[PDB]
């Protein structure tokens, strides 16, 4: 019993932390590095 609780705690926590990592990692990976004084060269 409480398997529904553990399943949903673990699934929604691991979904939330997987999305928080993927969103953070996406916003760093596809970050504009903004070196505009040199980027043309």
């Amino acid at each position: 019993l409480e398997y529904s609780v553990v399943f949903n705690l673990v699934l929604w926590i691991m979904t939330g932390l997987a999305l928080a990592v993927i969103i953070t990692s996406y916003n760093i990976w596809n970050m504009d590095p903004g070196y505009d004084s040199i980027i043309y060269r």
């Binding site: 019993l1 398997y3 529904s4 609780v5 399943f7 949903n8």
Partner: protein, 90 residues
Amino acid sequence: SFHCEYVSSLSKKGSLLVTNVPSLWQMTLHNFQIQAFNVTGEQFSYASDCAGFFSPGIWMGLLTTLFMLFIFTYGLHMILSLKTMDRFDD
């Protein structure tokens, strides 16, 4: 067959044994397993556990949260689409 971790009257143990009036008795079956139809020798058939992925409380918790998370995602969709001018007048 049916299987659960507890058939019990105690609140700590899923409380499946409801009593509609006060009583002197208590029971507990731990790892309760039963089958009273379509038996095939000494063995149980496959078991439909009590332990489903979603309880009623979870369904209501999710269909609240994963509804208002549509709202919150729209809140953030507009807020993250806020912008400011790069230039100003003379």
